[PDB]
Design a protein around this ligand. Sequence first.
Ligand SMILES: O=C(Nc1cccc(-c2cnco2)c1)N1c2nc(-c3cccc(C(F)(F)F)c3)ccc2N2CC[C@H]1C2
Ligand SMILES: O=C(Nc1cccc(-c2cnco2)c1)N1c2nc(-c3cccc(C(F)(F)F)c3)ccc2N2CC[C@H]1C2
Ligand SMILES: [Zn+2]
Ligand SMILES: [Zn+2]
Lengths: 339, 339
Amino acid sequence: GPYTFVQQHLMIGTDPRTILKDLLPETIPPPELDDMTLWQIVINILSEPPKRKKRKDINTIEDAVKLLQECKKIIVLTGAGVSVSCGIPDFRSRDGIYARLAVDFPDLPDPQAMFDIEYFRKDPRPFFKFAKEIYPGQFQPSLCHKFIALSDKEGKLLRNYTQNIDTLEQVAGIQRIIQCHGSFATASCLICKYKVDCEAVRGDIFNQVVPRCPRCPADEPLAIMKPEIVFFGENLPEQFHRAMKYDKDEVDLLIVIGSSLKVRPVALIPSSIPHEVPQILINREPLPHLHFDVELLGDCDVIINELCHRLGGEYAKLCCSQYLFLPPNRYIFHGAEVY
Amino acid sequence: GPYTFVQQHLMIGTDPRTILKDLLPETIPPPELDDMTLWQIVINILSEPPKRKKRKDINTIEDAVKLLQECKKIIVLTGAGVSVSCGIPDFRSRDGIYARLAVDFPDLPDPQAMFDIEYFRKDPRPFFKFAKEIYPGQFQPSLCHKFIALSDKEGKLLRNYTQNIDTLEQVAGIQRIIQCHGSFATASCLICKYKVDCEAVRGDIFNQVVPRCPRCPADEPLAIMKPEIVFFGENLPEQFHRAMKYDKDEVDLLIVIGSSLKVRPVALIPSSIPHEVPQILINREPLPHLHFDVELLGDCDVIINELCHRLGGEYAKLCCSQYLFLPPNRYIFHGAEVY
Ligand SMILES: O=C(Nc1cccc(-c2cnco2)c1)N1c2nc(-c3cccc(C(F)(F)F)c3)ccc2N2CC[C@H]1C2
Ligand SMILES: O=C(Nc1cccc(-c2cnco2)c1)N1c2nc(-c3cccc(C(F)(F)F)c3)ccc2N2CC[C@H]1C2
Ligand SMILES: [Zn+2]
Ligand SMILES: [Zn+2]
């Protein structure tokens, strides 16, 4: 669109600067800039998609808390950060759970292969030994899970969108949730798609027995009950999109906790809601590509404790401090790791 | 990489401007710019991939001709432009050849469907009626085809890469070629992959007979001989990549004719060769996103005639004029359509 606009102008010999004098007033582009380069800049300015800019009137951790109090339709996005204190065995790294699996199951190429649906059909047994070391109840939720849970009890949580699959969200008692990469909440047969509760296949998996489908014939191979993890290639749950279409025009506050927001669909949620709605980051590291009103950087448990401290009331009854303030709105706490 | 660099700096409260005073000397960013915005700019400058900038010493159509003379390892990229004079029925538009096909074959959803391999299996007959209206010999090559052909006779053509499938390249006698979206040059069975010449299935297709595979049993459905067009989904010919790996470090001149360079793999060829190697555009419209040393805009036949005029010698014996000069290097001829 803008591209054609510039093509038109090139056809007649327009001096880009007269266009740039309009698009960048109070800015004079250096003399030694190539004239085609100038045009490319023109296209860029016109092509740049509207990205939310930071609210100048929301800056301090005190402002954060007010929001937390006065808001009532809150969207919370959570990543690996929320579950760092939970002692969960890592599984993405070649050195992790894949280590203890490669010894009993030497047919595993990648730690990714156990999350591929194709290899799952060949051998589901390695995944299910993993599914045992992770299954809900085996791990205590973090202060953060507890924090989200209470705000949903208070009717304030509009939705918790998560990248996690540890399903500690349900363990911790959070009702209004959406697990984007799936979870252990339910299990569905690969074949007749018979859906069952989480508790249905608990015993089977705890006995290292591959859960079988009760509807399908017993003489059926792939009549296996698979926890509804989004395995490679598989589509994002339909519940996600339907939820966003509603939530985006309803939320009055977005909080990010523990995520470095670089993997879809969760990474695109900040950029997709009304720019006016306030936005708070809580995270080990800063996220330059986005404009957050308040940045609380450091260990996510730490910062959630510091906010429950300040929120008082029922929130303070969850707690078990020092920061560096970089203006206008950045706070560095203990666990700021930036790697 | 640059992203982490900026994360580090945010952790300690660096003023972006002291970084920008270094990255943009002789440029002072407006006062009212958000400090996170400034950082985003920092990331952009550091993240920007090296793109060839225009040679200041190559500008005029006379310079173009010198190149054409003194060069001997020339890469020529061609698009729809080269074949506009050739009277070929269009086939991409819903209103085109798909018009005369939808009446005899009402099972066609798209004009794209006849280029899908999946629908081709269901019914190949519509494609083959198209393949008849297009088949080599039925159309006379343009002045441009002839131009490329002669330069390859003279040993100057390193390679002609094309987006076209009209195969007028072989009709016109160009040996050193690469047809990126495939061509009618050869045909291969969907099953045993028996390869045959173009002339092998000429008779069959001219009689509206679906060419059959001589190796496969006669009682075989998909033993059909398919012209090696890249149909939807299919991979780019292996001949392409192997050719580029050689050609990129060998070419001394790149010429673009008739293409608006926006569809891969052909669109990425200018950006992928040594920046020092000169680059000439010949095209209905200008291509802002790229930096061409000389821009000859207008009908491609016109401009090729004007160059054969000037090249003299064997080139002038092909010919059957007015321009507007926009400095430093843009020429507008007759067919400049910019749509
Ligand atoms: O896009 C810009 N510059 C730019 C400058 C100002 C604003 C924007 C912009 C992009 N989206 C909204 O605004 C973009 N580019 C750019 N800008 C410059 C540039 C350098 C110094 C000063 C200036 C400026 F903007 F004129 F002051 C631009 C140089 C090369 C480039 N490259 C060619 C096009 C790209 C990459
Ligand atoms: O990328 C730029 N600007 C920019 C400016 C100068 C050079 C480059 C650039 C990009 N690649 C090589 O150089 C890019 N952006 C940009 N630039 C500006 C801008 C406006 C006026 C002046 C200037 C400048 F560059 F400081 F003079 C930048 C404003 C907003 C933005 N947006 C936030 C980041 C994007 C989009
Ligand atoms: Zn079943
Ligand atoms: Zn065959």
